[PDB]
């Protein structure tokens, strides 16, 4: 790998510089190099990995949605034929997006998840696994769509089971997991009632635990609770 010659600490340092410079592709490449050193990641390092790939795939997803919208309009009645170019370019972006998701899933499978024993690391990685299968599901249309959806579901479910046993209801990882699993239910699994129920129960159980928190932890938890509330307002 192109980062094989760089020290682990230098890769982490450069990932932080890349973030400051908004160079998210570089940041992801540095963090991939750091993971491939084979040591477990600290909490801060896990968050750098996540930020890097979330920003890369986020740009790809936004571009894919623009292109898919254009393609769908081209397929309406009365639309002038423009040739294969819209489909081709949507496919190009789609293939790049799938490659990034496969890269992340590959890091998780070789070998982040299997070495993650603490709840905070294991839930973090399983949530990531659910998220990147969810991004694959957003673009899937073929024989494997059901299996991709079930892979996302299974990863989220394992993360949920651990988080409910091992973490308080206000823990930000637990909250973000529940938020994303609720989005999965609504947008991927055609289960809006499940999405709504999960968001409401998550919000209410976190509300009841806020009294145990410091001011700083309260701020962290309430920020994510507000996203649950925003979704509930959209969905109801």
């Amino acid at each position: 790998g192109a980062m094989g010659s760089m020290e682990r600490a230098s890769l982490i340092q450069k990932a932080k510089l890349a973030e400051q410079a908004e160079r998210y592709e570089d940041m992801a490449a540095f963090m991939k190099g750091a993971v491939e050193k084979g040591e477990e990641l600290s909490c801060e390092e896990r968050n750098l990995l996540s930020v890097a790939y979330k920003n890369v795939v986020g740009g790809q997803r936004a571009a894919w949605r623009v292109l898919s919208s254009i393609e769908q309009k081209s397929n309406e009645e009365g639309s002038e034929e423009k040739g294969p170019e819209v489909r081709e370019y949507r496919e190009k972006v789609e293939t790049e997006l799938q490659g990034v998701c496969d890269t992340v899933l590959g890091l998780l499978d070789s070998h982040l998840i299997k070495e993650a024993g603490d709840a905070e690391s294991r839930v973090f990685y399983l949530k990531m696994k659910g998220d990147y299968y969810r991004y694959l599901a957003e673009v899937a249309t073929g024989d494997d769509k059901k299996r991709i959806i079930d892979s996302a579901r299974s990863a989220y479910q394992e993360a949920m089971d651990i988080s409910k046993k091992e973490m308080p209801p206000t823990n930000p990882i637990r909250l973000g997991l529940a938020l994303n699993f609720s989005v999965f239910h609504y947008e991927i699994a055609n289960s809006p009632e499940e999405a709504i129920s999960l968001a409401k129960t998550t919000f209410d159980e976190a509300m009841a635990d806020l009294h145990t928190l410091s001011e700083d932890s309260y701020k962290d938890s309430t920020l994510i609770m507000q996203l649950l509330r925003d979704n509930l307002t959209l969905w109801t």
């Binding site: 979330k54 973000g176 938020l179 989005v183 947008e187 994510i224 996203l227 959209l234 969905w235």
Partner: peptide, 5 residues
């Protein structure tokens, strides 16, 4: 919908 930022 909003996911984790």
């Amino acid at each position: 919908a909003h996911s984790s930022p």
